Amino acid sequence: KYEAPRHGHLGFLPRKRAASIRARVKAFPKDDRSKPVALTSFLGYKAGMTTIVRDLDRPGSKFHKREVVEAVTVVDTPPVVVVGVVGYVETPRGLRSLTTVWAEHLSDEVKRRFYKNWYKSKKKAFTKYSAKYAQDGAGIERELARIKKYASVVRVLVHTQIRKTPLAQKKAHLAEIQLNGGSISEKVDWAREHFEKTVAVDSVFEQNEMIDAIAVTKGHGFEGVTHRWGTKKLPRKTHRGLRKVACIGAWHPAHVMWSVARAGQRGYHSRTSINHKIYRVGKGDDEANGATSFDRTKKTITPMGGFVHYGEIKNDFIMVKGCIPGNRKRIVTLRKSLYTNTSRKALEEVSLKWIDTASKFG
RNA sequence: CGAGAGACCGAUAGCGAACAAGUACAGUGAUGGAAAGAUGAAAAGAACUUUGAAAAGAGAGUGAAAAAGUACGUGAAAUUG
RNA sequence: CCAGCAUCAGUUUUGGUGGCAGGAUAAACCCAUAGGAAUGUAGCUUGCCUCGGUAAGUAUUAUAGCCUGUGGGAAUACUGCCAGCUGGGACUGAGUGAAAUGACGUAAGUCAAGGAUGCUGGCAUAAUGGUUAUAUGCCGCCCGUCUUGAAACACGGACCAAG
RNA sequence: UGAAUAGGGUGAAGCCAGAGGAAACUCUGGUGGAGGCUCGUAGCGGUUUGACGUGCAAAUCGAUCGUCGAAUUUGGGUAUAGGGGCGAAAGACUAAUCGAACCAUCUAGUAGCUGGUUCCUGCCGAAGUUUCCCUCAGGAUAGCACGAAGCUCGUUUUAUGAG
RNA sequence: UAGAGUUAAGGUGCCGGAAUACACGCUCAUCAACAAAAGGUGUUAGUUCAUCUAGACAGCCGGACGGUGGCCAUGGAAGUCGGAAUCCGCUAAGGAGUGUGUAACAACUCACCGGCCGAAUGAACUAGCCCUGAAAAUGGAUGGCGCCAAGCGUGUUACCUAUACUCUACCGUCAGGGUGCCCUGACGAGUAGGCAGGCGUGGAGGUCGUGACGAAGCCUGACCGUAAGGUCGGGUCGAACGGCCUCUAGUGCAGAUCUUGGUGGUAGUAGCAAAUAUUCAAAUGAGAACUUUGAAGACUGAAGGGGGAAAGGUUCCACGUCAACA
RNA sequence: CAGCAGGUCUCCAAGGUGAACAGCCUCUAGUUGAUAGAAUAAUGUGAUAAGGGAAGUCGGCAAAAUAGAUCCGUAACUUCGGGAUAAGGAUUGGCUCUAAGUUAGAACUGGUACGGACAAGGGGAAUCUGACUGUCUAAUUAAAACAUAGCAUUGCGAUGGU
RNA sequence: GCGGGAGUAACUAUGACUCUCUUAAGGUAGCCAAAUGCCUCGUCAUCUAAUUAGUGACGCGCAUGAAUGGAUUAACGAGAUUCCCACUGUCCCUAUCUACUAUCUAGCGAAACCACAGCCAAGGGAACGGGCUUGGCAGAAUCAGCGGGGAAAGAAGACCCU
RNA sequence: UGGCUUGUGGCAGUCAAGCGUUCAUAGCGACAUUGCUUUUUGAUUCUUCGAUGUCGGCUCUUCCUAUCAUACCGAAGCAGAAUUCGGUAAGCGUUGGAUUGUUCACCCACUAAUAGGGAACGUGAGCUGGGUUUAGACCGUCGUGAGACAGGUUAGUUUUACCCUACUGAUGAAUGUUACCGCAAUAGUAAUUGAACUUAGUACGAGAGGAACAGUUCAUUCGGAUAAUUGGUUUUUGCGGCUGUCUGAUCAGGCAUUGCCGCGAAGCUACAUCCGCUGGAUUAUGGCUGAACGCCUCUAAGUCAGAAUCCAUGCUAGAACGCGGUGAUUUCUUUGCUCCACACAAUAUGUACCUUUUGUAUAAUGGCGUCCUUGUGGCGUCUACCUUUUGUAUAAUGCUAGCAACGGUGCACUUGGCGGAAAGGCCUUGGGUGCUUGCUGGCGUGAAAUUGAACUAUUUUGCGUGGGGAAAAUCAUUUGUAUACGA
């Protein structure tokens, strides 16, 4: 009953498909016990990268404040629209509300979405898009919600506004998003001014915190043991056992556990990557790219031309030094970081020195 | 070749074979060699009518009975509604 | 027709409770009186040191050990009784209606003998109004053959018919 | 005894000429003939590697490798049949069988060894021990109870013999 | 062979029926649950003795004396190396010495012993509960829950307890008294094996009885009770077979990698025949990618062109069919 | 046995390119088989590439260097029949011109490269045995086994030896 | 078919030569640690980041020796080791793209093939239990995957004795 | 082979005399033994012939620490530092080559440095087949010999599709429904080290030397993220060279020889880019007040400081963990009106105690009688939950109707308000229903109309009847960073 060393990550079991295109995360990043109102996460779309030629954050370096080449995902963040701020409190059973406080006017892309009109799946009943529901009487009793003592974290059901980013569809992408803030009272009080229609981007993301890069990754294949775990080939490479593996079980006992080196789905969950440090926030048009060299390929920010398989960016973006899962077209969900490691390098803006602009190709 | 009988069978028995069993077949080849019986008194083995394309499905006649209809005794089960 | 099980009245056998007694014996749950040996508690007096106590006298306040003499108590190992009370096995008898072997008692009769059940149950050959889906709960490891020894992870059936 | 090797490279031996040499060596050209000379196809042989083995042939298929005017390859006719035929040898070879072909009969040869083997109840029910064997998974005999007919103890008291 | 009457071996906190009982006791560690040499201020009892108001013992506090460096091992020996004498001193204590210290002096402490204090303390010897010695790999792993009494000894009490024990009847063969058989003794778990008894097929001397106004059989129901398998009854048959009375044979099935065949199984799963592109339109028709025809392309041309012998023998051909069969 | 990826004597010989009968490619001339469409995982089946240059695996197995024509230049030693294409270097086609008609000599330019499809040698240094060519285990042993031209003794006068 | 025991040279160290026993009587030319060596990482030089191969000898021959022959000695090979030059997907180091299928579908239609049953940890035990004792755990309609057990597809084991 | 013992023996405790400068234990240890144990190395036929296939390594699937290195501590016959030794404690890290078949044997270059033990050593239906059970041929050694050997050499079979389970991915369905997502009662997880800037030329020393402790950065290596300044691939779509033949020829265009061969960018990726440590519980050990026990000291009362691991932070998830709301008439075993009145069929706090008949959860469990076979047949009427105990509706006056008094006590529970904020609760005005105590009167006597019937109180479900009311989608066409198919 031996062991051979840990080639590949064990605990992505089961390797379940992330059906919904936007990433979810049950364990949300807990409160900013500093900022009086925030959100927990936000929204993005994966677009492309640039080489930010700047200078180091770590100030005591041997080559301190030199020229530094760096990755950056420049993800488009249009602000999300509220349907209603749901006032989750407690009861003596559990995490149960009392009322929501609706928004009056929603967006336009609420037409096609609020349903589950898809084949081999359940509906919803005729809870369609909004008429004019509970907000008038509901807005005052969320004050009385904290007076219960039985009171929990108040949240807000949101939807996107799409075309603004170059993707042309008008059926919105849904999610609930938790409201953070100072205390339970404050994430209710200041969130009354949030449900009006649209929220702020800058409430959750302060410039130069960190931002944990969760999104939905690509489904690579039905990947075998070589790529999915990390086995080799045998150098004889004949017969049956080329890209196979050896042991799955063991003689004594016959019954093993969930470590075994088999084939199946790779990637494609709502997989969480850790503290990618936020570079800058730029609202409109600032940085460019497009340089005629081989580096890595096919995602170009305002060159001569545009991006391939996305569209040219004329919106409002947030720049994360690092990355975030998906590929082109894929809609992402940027969660914030609860444990912010390094000291916040805010107040002033971070350096942009110069950047190229030409073709990307020949 | 004929007759008679024995505590001597009634289609897995016994002569290879009860019946077109050496004949649709197989092996160069004296040879091996299976499937395989069946109405009634009289065949009268269904005219005629009606539906469907033939198959198939219903009324009507013949005859002692059609609760005998041609693949024609009695009929069980896996199989199979 | 055997076992379980049977109206209603009377009785045996075996053991105990509770009340009582004999064999045989006297300690006790607790039993008198006289003389001598002993020595505990309360109260008083006296002496000495010290603020807290102690020693001696106290038969002259009240009471006892252990022995001797005299006198008086004394329910039970074993064994039987009461059917007061309490639980059962076991026997006799009931329209009409026998024969043989008995006892004691009576103007009476009972015990004891000796003559005679009813339905299913296991299941091979001549039964009750019957086949049977079937909760819940408890018991619960099936052969022909070898060997001291296989439900066993020894051999040997889809299933039916021929031999 | 009949049929088959296109194409392509060299050339001793024999014989002559020309320059040169005392003479012979040397030395320059032509004429010419013997090849396991020699080279590539026909005919013809089998080193490596992958896929098959319930599939196309009862040892198969793909990629890859050898020889050829010599100890050359091949067809047809005809002859040799089991202790014989036959050998540069490997009992290779003979109808997928060859260390003695195959077919049929005597033959249902035989198996001191192993396995399998068909109603029930009742009466009633042991033994794994031995003298002994060219004798050992056996069996003559003896120990113990089968079956059937007719009949058969000891508890313990006096001593005697032996560690 | 069955229900009662009484109890063994052994159990009662709980899984799972029965004391969370009673009395006394060490110990409370979850002891209970392996282990020696060898060892211990847990903690209790008995016996003997040193020791004690004749001032036990501890802590704290002193005198550390004169002879004197006693003497002697030895290079040196110094109380302080080895070995012997064994005191005086001052006669209310200091030995010719308990321990440390420097080669050693130099330095220091004290049983012996002094001074405060004022009651039971201490060595042996014996016994018990504890306690130290004790490491290995899949999930409690020295119990599931867990228990500090729901542990254990000693003494006691209550409840539970073998078809045996035990009551009485019943089943099996045989004996005696007296037939017909009844009373009735002793035993009855069971494999080989023998005997007895009972059920059994084909067949038969016998054969009358039953039968076409409904025989064997098929199929289905009732269906006695000793394990063996057989009588009656219902739907139905269209000719066969038993009273009586006894004799005879190829005479009872679960099995040797067996035997005669169908049917199951993997399974409607794989296979569906060596990688020389196929696209589009028509004729005919019930049905057309396939026959057949046209347009167009892949493809080979020392053969996909041409063509004789062995061997086979009418398979060519035209006519004619779509069933079995590809 | 088979409507099986098979065994199976044996006939005839055009064009231009490359010796012939390789290859190349059209004629005379013939034809894609007794099932089919769409996507095109894991896994088994084809090629490309940075940097390194043997470091890896029983295993240079696998994989790489190189290649023609013509000229120069080149190693021990012989059974004198030999080794040589050793090593070490240099250049091509095409077109013009030499000559109004093999072939070779002069002359000019360009590209990644003149054999441009196709096609076409790795070399240096030390060492064994059977002389050479040849025979071989039919379903797990291609060799040092045995033969080989040649040589000797012995049987042995053939009416031999056998 | 082709010997033993004993004694013996300056000096560490050795036995030329000599004697004695035994038997029918005791070997030359030339070579050695083997397809044969117990003893032996023997003993020495050179090579190697270590290097016993390459190549240089040592003598310490368990047990070399001339016709089913020593020995001279050139050519030839799908046969056998090492050093040396250029170098290499074998590996470092894996990625990417491509042909065909898997996924999925139609048709007709295999294969040997028939145990009640299908958790694990501890415990007893025909002796390594999903199956038996306790305790923890364990639902069904469905498809694609992958090589660990049970021990597959199969033949009365290959060792081993009669 | 498995079992057994530990033979042959390994390890430790350790008798501790010796000997190391004095000196039983810094160290060395005569002489050996006791317990443990299963490793050197084997005793035994206990259990096995219708299989019990070998070694070193590649690859991938565990657990323990008889402990090499990382956290924490103490001591020396140790000057700091080099050197020497012992305790708490299993989360993680644990090299590259050469000799040799080969770990053993035996050597080198570094590096922070290169552990121990078991587990069918994962381990031939994943893998090599060098190591490892037969068959060409030769030598040594032995026997009369065919031939043999406890001695060596040369060639000489790894077949195929996993029945059941382990098991890794993807869909389909269960207390109205439900697109969409947060709790953390729980499940899976991640992990290491060095150098340099710099601390400091300070501590301490004869001399070589150079400690405590900070702030700062980065390089080996792993996983997840990874598509821009890198490195390459890109048959898709474009660009360079050579041969033959056809389309009538020239020519303009094609098939064909891998993408013919020669050179880029879609589409992907690394040889590459980005990122990564909170609170709680306690041990060795040291003290703190103070014992057991006049002094004393960490423990009996009393009371604190305190370790990688432990344990949680950080991320995934069938209330036993995808929480659960707004707003409202579902994919789906399956019947399906948004209304609500009457009637009917069965079950229940542990569904008791128990027992006979082919047939008891069940009345044995008001009282009395006309009828009346009679210990029969037949006819008529009916009084909670919950609690106490001998038991428990427990309840003594022939029945029924009417009236009066003490003037209290119980329950359901509307209307009206306040407040908790899901456990939904109470109180009181108007209103509704029932009960205590005492007295008095009557008991004759008849129809309308209709029928199949219940352990029918209660609760759940269903049918019949009746009056005012009423709405989402499945398919499929076409596509994605959605991709295996699904979702």
PDB file of N, CA and C (backbone and C1' of nucleotides) in Angstrom, chain A residues 6 17 25-26 46 51 61 98 113 124 247 263 295 297-299 324 335, chain H residues 60 62 168 170 178 180 182 218 226-229 268 315-316 326 421:
ATOM      1  N   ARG A   6       2.966  13.843  -4.624  1.00  0.00           N
ATOM      2  CA  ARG A   6       1.716  14.468  -4.985  1.00  0.00           C
ATOM      3  C   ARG A   6       1.848  15.282  -6.251  1.00  0.00           C
ATOM      4  N   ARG A  17     -18.432  20.552 -13.185  1.00  0.00           N
ATOM      5  CA  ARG A  17     -18.593  21.610 -14.162  1.00  0.00           C
ATOM      6  C   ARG A  17     -19.295  22.781 -13.523  1.00  0.00           C
ATOM      7  N   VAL A  25     -19.229  31.830  -4.958  1.00  0.00           N
ATOM      8  CA  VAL A  25     -18.288  31.599  -3.887  1.00  0.00           C
ATOM      9  C   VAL A  25     -19.059  31.721  -2.597  1.00  0.00           C
ATOM     10  N   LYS A  26     -19.380  30.560  -1.977  1.00  0.00           N
ATOM     11  CA  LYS A  26     -20.160  30.437  -0.763  1.00  0.00           C
ATOM     12  C   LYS A  26     -19.507  31.144   0.397  1.00  0.00           C
ATOM     13  N   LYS A  46     -13.617  39.265 -18.847  1.00  0.00           N
ATOM     14  CA  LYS A  46     -12.229  39.037 -19.199  1.00  0.00           C
ATOM     15  C   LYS A  46     -12.029  39.491 -20.625  1.00  0.00           C
ATOM     16  N   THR A  51       1.459  45.071 -21.130  1.00  0.00           N
ATOM     17  CA  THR A  51       2.670  45.068 -20.328  1.00  0.00           C
ATOM     18  C   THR A  51       2.775  46.419 -19.685  1.00  0.00           C
ATOM     19  N   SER A  61      14.328  47.038  -2.485  1.00  0.00           N
ATOM     20  CA  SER A  61      14.901  46.101  -3.429  1.00  0.00           C
ATOM     21  C   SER A  61      16.295  46.498  -3.867  1.00  0.00           C
ATOM     22  N   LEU A  98     -37.678  38.739   6.036  1.00  0.00           N
ATOM     23  CA  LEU A  98     -38.900  39.327   6.519  1.00  0.00           C
ATOM     24  C   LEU A  98     -39.518  40.104   5.374  1.00  0.00           C
ATOM     25  N   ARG A 113     -34.690  37.473 -19.350  1.00  0.00           N
ATOM     26  CA  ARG A 113     -33.974  36.663 -18.389  1.00  0.00           C
ATOM     27  C   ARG A 113     -34.824  36.055 -17.314  1.00  0.00           C
ATOM     28  N   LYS A 124     -40.147  28.315 -12.819  1.00  0.00           N
ATOM     29  CA  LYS A 124     -40.042  29.271 -11.745  1.00  0.00           C
ATOM     30  C   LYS A 124     -41.437  29.546 -11.246  1.00  0.00           C
ATOM     31  N   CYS A 247      -0.733   2.492 -10.303  1.00  0.00           N
ATOM     32  CA  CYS A 247      -1.644   2.142  -9.239  1.00  0.00           C
ATOM     33  C   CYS A 247      -2.773   3.116  -9.012  1.00  0.00           C
ATOM     34  N   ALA A 263      -8.785   9.592 -15.030  1.00  0.00           N
ATOM     35  CA  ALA A 263      -9.087  10.589 -16.037  1.00  0.00           C
ATOM     36  C   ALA A 263     -10.407  11.267 -15.757  1.00  0.00           C
ATOM     37  N   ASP A 295       5.018  37.413 -28.052  1.00  0.00           N
ATOM     38  CA  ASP A 295       5.130  37.476 -26.622  1.00  0.00           C
ATOM     39  C   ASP A 295       4.199  36.378 -26.180  1.00  0.00           C
ATOM     40  N   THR A 297      -0.311  35.802 -27.292  1.00  0.00           N
ATOM     41  CA  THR A 297      -1.053  36.214 -28.476  1.00  0.00           C
ATOM     42  C   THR A 297      -2.552  36.316 -28.251  1.00  0.00           C
ATOM     43  N   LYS A 298      -3.205  37.205 -29.055  1.00  0.00           N
ATOM     44  CA  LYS A 298      -4.629  37.230 -29.360  1.00  0.00           C
ATOM     45  C   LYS A 298      -5.540  37.955 -28.389  1.00  0.00           C
ATOM     46  N   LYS A 299      -5.064  38.976 -27.647  1.00  0.00           N
ATOM     47  CA  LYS A 299      -5.908  39.767 -26.770  1.00  0.00           C
ATOM     48  C   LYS A 299      -5.252  41.132 -26.712  1.00  0.00           C
ATOM     49  N   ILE A 324      -7.180  36.434 -14.061  1.00  0.00           N
ATOM     50  CA  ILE A 324      -8.479  36.028 -13.551  1.00  0.00           C
ATOM     51  C   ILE A 324      -9.040  34.974 -14.501  1.00  0.00           C
ATOM     52  N   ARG A 335     -14.044  38.837  -6.790  1.00  0.00           N
ATOM     53  CA  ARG A 335     -14.290  38.934  -5.366  1.00  0.00           C
ATOM     54  C   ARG A 335     -13.185  39.764  -4.765  1.00  0.00           C
TER      55      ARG A 335
ATOM     56  P     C H  60       4.832   9.768 -11.166  1.00  0.00           P
ATOM     57  O5'   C H  60       3.657   9.417 -10.163  1.00  0.00           O
ATOM     58  C5'   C H  60       2.286   9.676 -10.535  1.00  0.00           C
ATOM     59  C4'   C H  60       1.384   8.448 -10.326  1.00  0.00           C
ATOM     60  C3'   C H  60       0.992   8.133  -8.882  1.00  0.00           C
ATOM     61  O3'   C H  60      -0.064   9.013  -8.465  1.00  0.00           O
ATOM     62  C1'   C H  60       1.650   6.144  -9.972  1.00  0.00           C
ATOM     63  P     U H  62      -2.588   7.767  -1.591  1.00  0.00           P
ATOM     64  O5'   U H  62      -2.644   6.606  -0.497  1.00  0.00           O
ATOM     65  C5'   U H  62      -2.259   7.040   0.834  1.00  0.00           C
ATOM     66  C4'   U H  62      -2.173   5.878   1.833  1.00  0.00           C
ATOM     67  C3'   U H  62      -1.762   6.312   3.240  1.00  0.00           C
ATOM     68  O3'   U H  62      -2.881   6.894   3.925  1.00  0.00           O
ATOM     69  C1'   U H  62      -0.570   4.366   2.647  1.00  0.00           C
ATOM     70  P     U H 168     -13.214   8.443  -7.137  1.00  0.00           P
ATOM     71  O5'   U H 168     -12.038   8.362  -8.178  1.00  0.00           O
ATOM     72  C5'   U H 168     -11.331   9.523  -8.635  1.00  0.00           C
ATOM     73  C4'   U H 168     -11.667   9.887 -10.090  1.00  0.00           C
ATOM     74  C3'   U H 168     -12.878  10.782 -10.297  1.00  0.00           C
ATOM     75  O3'   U H 168     -12.545  12.131  -9.947  1.00  0.00           O
ATOM     76  C1'   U H 168     -12.858   9.069 -11.927  1.00  0.00           C
ATOM     77  P     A H 170     -18.012  16.364 -13.700  1.00  0.00           P
ATOM     78  O5'   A H 170     -19.099  15.679 -14.627  1.00  0.00           O
ATOM     79  C5'   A H 170     -19.098  16.087 -16.008  1.00  0.00           C
ATOM     80  C4'   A H 170     -20.326  15.544 -16.728  1.00  0.00           C
ATOM     81  C3'   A H 170     -21.691  15.829 -16.097  1.00  0.00           C
ATOM     82  O3'   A H 170     -22.065  17.193 -16.350  1.00  0.00           O
ATOM     83  C1'   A H 170     -21.591  13.597 -16.802  1.00  0.00           C
ATOM     84  P     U H 178     -39.168  22.988  -7.286  1.00  0.00           P
ATOM     85  O5'   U H 178     -38.561  24.317  -7.873  1.00  0.00           O
ATOM     86  C5'   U H 178     -38.898  24.822  -9.164  1.00  0.00           C
ATOM     87  C4'   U H 178     -38.614  26.323  -9.194  1.00  0.00           C
ATOM     88  C3'   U H 178     -37.328  26.814  -8.493  1.00  0.00           C
ATOM     89  O3'   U H 178     -36.242  26.661  -9.409  1.00  0.00           O
ATOM     90  C1'   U H 178     -39.170  28.114  -7.783  1.00  0.00           C
ATOM     91  P     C H 180     -30.234  30.316 -12.550  1.00  0.00           P
ATOM     92  O5'   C H 180     -30.291  31.345 -11.342  1.00  0.00           O
ATOM     93  C5'   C H 180     -29.284  32.378 -11.341  1.00  0.00           C
ATOM     94  C4'   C H 180     -29.353  33.225 -10.064  1.00  0.00           C
ATOM     95  C3'   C H 180     -28.827  32.561  -8.792  1.00  0.00           C
ATOM     96  O3'   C H 180     -27.393  32.579  -8.762  1.00  0.00           O
ATOM     97  C1'   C H 180     -30.867  33.603  -8.321  1.00  0.00           C
ATOM     98  P     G H 182     -22.417  33.439  -3.547  1.00  0.00           P
ATOM     99  O5'   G H 182     -22.659  34.121  -2.145  1.00  0.00           O
ATOM    100  C5'   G H 182     -22.384  33.475  -0.894  1.00  0.00           C
ATOM    101  C4'   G H 182     -23.157  34.199   0.213  1.00  0.00           C
ATOM    102  C3'   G H 182     -22.986  33.792   1.682  1.00  0.00           C
ATOM    103  O3'   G H 182     -21.741  34.289   2.184  1.00  0.00           O
ATOM    104  C1'   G H 182     -25.253  34.302   1.178  1.00  0.00           C
ATOM    105  P     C H 218      12.675  41.951  -4.586  1.00  0.00           P
ATOM    106  O5'   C H 218      13.204  40.458  -4.696  1.00  0.00           O
ATOM    107  C5'   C H 218      14.251  40.157  -5.640  1.00  0.00           C
ATOM    108  C4'   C H 218      14.951  38.815  -5.343  1.00  0.00           C
ATOM    109  C3'   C H 218      14.273  37.520  -5.771  1.00  0.00           C
ATOM    110  O3'   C H 218      14.196  37.411  -7.190  1.00  0.00           O
ATOM    111  C1'   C H 218      15.372  37.237  -3.688  1.00  0.00           C
ATOM    112  P     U H 226      -6.335  31.939 -15.516  1.00  0.00           P
ATOM    113  O5'   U H 226      -4.833  31.944 -16.009  1.00  0.00           O
ATOM    114  C5'   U H 226      -4.159  33.207 -15.839  1.00  0.00           C
ATOM    115  C4'   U H 226      -2.732  33.175 -16.367  1.00  0.00           C
ATOM    116  C3'   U H 226      -2.612  32.942 -17.872  1.00  0.00           C
ATOM    117  O3'   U H 226      -2.728  34.191 -18.576  1.00  0.00           O
ATOM    118  C1'   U H 226      -1.124  31.515 -16.671  1.00  0.00           C
ATOM    119  P     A H 227      -4.124  34.807 -18.995  1.00  0.00           P
ATOM    120  O5'   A H 227      -3.840  35.381 -20.434  1.00  0.00           O
ATOM    121  C5'   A H 227      -2.867  36.414 -20.628  1.00  0.00           C
ATOM    122  C4'   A H 227      -2.072  36.268 -21.937  1.00  0.00           C
ATOM    123  C3'   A H 227      -2.910  36.353 -23.211  1.00  0.00           C
ATOM    124  O3'   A H 227      -2.108  36.868 -24.291  1.00  0.00           O
ATOM    125  C1'   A H 227      -2.140  34.155 -22.954  1.00  0.00           C
ATOM    126  P     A H 228      -2.266  38.386 -24.697  1.00  0.00           P
ATOM    127  O5'   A H 228      -0.795  38.895 -24.961  1.00  0.00           O
ATOM    128  C5'   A H 228      -0.643  40.134 -25.697  1.00  0.00           C
ATOM    129  C4'   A H 228       0.165  41.171 -24.908  1.00  0.00           C
ATOM    130  C3'   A H 228       1.680  40.958 -24.930  1.00  0.00           C
ATOM    131  O3'   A H 228       2.222  41.333 -26.188  1.00  0.00           O
ATOM    132  C1'   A H 228       1.004  41.312 -22.728  1.00  0.00           C
ATOM    133  P     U H 229       3.180  42.456 -26.710  1.00  0.00           P
ATOM    134  O5'   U H 229       4.391  42.525 -25.667  1.00  0.00           O
ATOM    135  C5'   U H 229       5.353  43.570 -25.934  1.00  0.00           C
ATOM    136  C4'   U H 229       6.546  43.562 -24.962  1.00  0.00           C
ATOM    137  C3'   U H 229       7.626  42.507 -25.171  1.00  0.00           C
ATOM    138  O3'   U H 229       8.393  42.801 -26.349  1.00  0.00           O
ATOM    139  C1'   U H 229       7.285  42.915 -22.852  1.00  0.00           C
ATOM    140  P     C H 268      -7.399  31.025 -28.201  1.00  0.00           P
ATOM    141  O5'   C H 268      -6.244  29.983 -27.865  1.00  0.00           O
ATOM    142  C5'   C H 268      -6.664  28.750 -27.234  1.00  0.00           C
ATOM    143  C4'   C H 268      -5.522  27.728 -27.087  1.00  0.00           C
ATOM    144  C3'   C H 268      -4.416  28.031 -26.074  1.00  0.00           C
ATOM    145  O3'   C H 268      -4.885  27.853 -24.726  1.00  0.00           O
ATOM    146  C1'   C H 268      -3.440  27.159 -28.028  1.00  0.00           C
ATOM    147  P     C H 315     -12.555  32.521   2.635  1.00  0.00           P
ATOM    148  O5'   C H 315     -12.501  31.259   1.665  1.00  0.00           O
ATOM    149  C5'   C H 315     -12.645  31.489   0.250  1.00  0.00           C
ATOM    150  C4'   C H 315     -12.351  30.246  -0.603  1.00  0.00           C
ATOM    151  C3'   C H 315     -13.308  29.057  -0.474  1.00  0.00           C
ATOM    152  O3'   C H 315     -14.504  29.320  -1.220  1.00  0.00           O
ATOM    153  C1'   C H 315     -11.072  28.301  -0.473  1.00  0.00           C
ATOM    154  P     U H 316     -15.772  28.383  -1.046  1.00  0.00           P
ATOM    155  O5'   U H 316     -15.504  27.160  -2.009  1.00  0.00           O
ATOM    156  C5'   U H 316     -16.302  26.914  -3.186  1.00  0.00           C
ATOM    157  C4'   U H 316     -16.467  25.406  -3.470  1.00  0.00           C
ATOM    158  C3'   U H 316     -17.410  24.717  -2.462  1.00  0.00           C
ATOM    159  O3'   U H 316     -18.792  24.798  -2.798  1.00  0.00           O
ATOM    160  C1'   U H 316     -15.328  23.651  -2.368  1.00  0.00           C
ATOM    161  P     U H 326     -39.674  36.872   2.127  1.00  0.00           P
ATOM    162  O5'   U H 326     -39.596  37.384   0.624  1.00  0.00           O
ATOM    163  C5'   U H 326     -39.277  38.772   0.408  1.00  0.00           C
ATOM    164  C4'   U H 326     -38.987  39.068  -1.072  1.00  0.00           C
ATOM    165  C3'   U H 326     -40.181  39.180  -2.012  1.00  0.00           C
ATOM    166  O3'   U H 326     -40.794  40.461  -1.847  1.00  0.00           O
ATOM    167  C1'   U H 326     -38.351  38.022  -3.060  1.00  0.00           C
ATOM    168  P     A H 421     -37.742  41.220  20.345  1.00  0.00           P
ATOM    169  O5'   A H 421     -38.580  40.452  19.254  1.00  0.00           O
ATOM    170  C5'   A H 421     -38.438  39.032  19.103  1.00  0.00           C
ATOM    171  C4'   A H 421     -39.364  38.471  18.004  1.00  0.00           C
ATOM    172  C3'   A H 421     -38.814  38.689  16.583  1.00  0.00           C
ATOM    173  O3'   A H 421     -39.146  37.592  15.712  1.00  0.00           O
ATOM    174  C1'   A H 421     -40.825  39.898  16.834  1.00  0.00           C
TER     175        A H 421
END
